[PDB]
Design a protein around this ligand. Structure first.
Ligand SMILES: *[C@@H](CC(=O)OCC)[C@H](C[C@@H]1CCNC1=O)NC(=O)[C@H](Cc1ccccc1)NC(=O)[C@H](CC(=O)OC(C)(C)C)NC(=O)OCc1ccccc1
Ligand SMILES: *[C@@H](CC(=O)OCC)[C@H](C[C@@H]1CCNC1=O)NC(=O)[C@H](Cc1ccccc1)NC(=O)[C@H](CC(=O)OC(C)(C)C)NC(=O)OCc1ccccc1
Lengths: 188, 188
């Protein structure tokens, strides 16, 4: 069966509702005060988190070595609570998955769980006119309002929802190495 | 935890998308070719079931002995498939419940599961100007598009969703005796 309990434990401890100029997004918190949001949410220097205006201390829009959009933005937030560290639930590598759940946490839908079925490593996607890499595809008619939703199987947090064409949904991958403690680059 | 597996087994074998002049509703099939739908769906003599136009052979709008709306309409349908008989999962009596799931099956949401928490036997509700009895209440901001959605706990199918005020959701009760094989009244 689909891993509803796992999905629910992630939603309960590791999501917040985030709101930018582009609207509301489910927001997965990963560790400390670091979270993710689709790049097309256009995060600026402040964001609403559960309706509380919040400084965005850092925002990194991920791109691969071909200089292509990965559609993940990692944000660091000025808030008091630390997120439970869920980095050990992130996959090490690209992969296909079975029987995944897509979980949403917005004002309209404070917790909703959608079994999306099989998830395939899809690769290239033209996302609203933006070439994008490292996409996961599921055959489910996902909708507006579901962006940022968390895609899990039991024991793994695998992506966040970023797109769909009416029949399929698409998630940007999460990989363990996006979040490993590291060294010193000038990045802005 | 919430009974997601049970909810999913009911959705998979016993729901269809129903469409009337009022729009789409999740439709719970109970036994044979008998199903339910909120009364305010205004069922006529034909209905779409999974987009196939279908004769409604019978429609009974339930009312209690005070001649008050219960908001359940029982329909008998001209179709080939019989529903799995789920009458043994219907509660015998009015009751309060813990940790319920609300499940939806429409074109926009082909399967979505929402933990709504505690469900209380609420009684009287003024439903869009219509006095209504035998209502169940949960504290969840349910929305348009969720009418007809199935409210379960493990082992029990307890109601179908019919209303909400922005903060609470309301379901009409299902009771085992609504569907017991019976005798002879002229009812139209
Ligand atoms: C989530 C964000 C949102 O609601 O927009 C606020 C600005 C949303 C979710 C998908 C929309 C439809 N169903 C979904 O699952 N994502 C998008 O809208 C996304 C851009 C975006 C904006 C903000 C944050 C993240 C992402 N754009 C798309 O998904 C497009 C929509 C689209 O073009 O759909 C139609 C084809 C018009 C129906 N999807 C897309 O480009 O898919 C690839 C494609 C495009 C054209 C033909 C075939 C396939
Ligand atoms: C499902 C049906 C639908 O979408 O309408 C198609 C005609 C819908 C679900 C609720 C609407 C808002 N959230 C919900 O969970 N039910 C209704 O719209 C229902 C009438 C109906 C129509 C068709 C089939 C079944 C039922 N009406 C209500 O739920 C009303 C809506 C309402 O008045 O909401 C506001 C107060 C305007 C926000 N709800 C209601 O009457 O609640 C009691 C109440 C009323 C006024 C003040 C406080 C409490």
């Amino acid at each position: 069966g689909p891993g509803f309990d796992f999905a629910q434990a992630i939603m309960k401890k590791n999501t917040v509702v985030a709101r930018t100029e582009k609207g509301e997004f489910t927001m997965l918190g990963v560790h400390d005060r670091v979270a993710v949001i689709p790049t097309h949410a256009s995060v600026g220097e402040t964001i609403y988190i559960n309706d509380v205006e919040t400084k965005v201390l850092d925002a990194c829009a991920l791109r691969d070595l071909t200089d292509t959009n990965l559609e993940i933005t990692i944000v660091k937030l000025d808030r008091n609570q630390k997120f439970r560290d869920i980095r050990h639930f992130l996959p090490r590598y690209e992969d296909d998955y079975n029987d995944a759940v897509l979980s949403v946490h917005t004002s309209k839908f404070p917790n909703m769980y959608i079994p999306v079925g099989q998830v395939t490593n899809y690769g290239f996607l033209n996302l609203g006119g933006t070439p994008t890499h490292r996409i996961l595809m599921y055959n489910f008619p996902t909708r507006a309002g579901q962006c940022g939703g968390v895609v899990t199987t039991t024991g793994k947090v695998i992506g966040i929802h970023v797109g769909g064409n009416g029949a399929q949904g698409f998630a940007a991958m999460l990989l363990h190495s996006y979040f490993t403690d590291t060294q010193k680059h000038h990045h802005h």
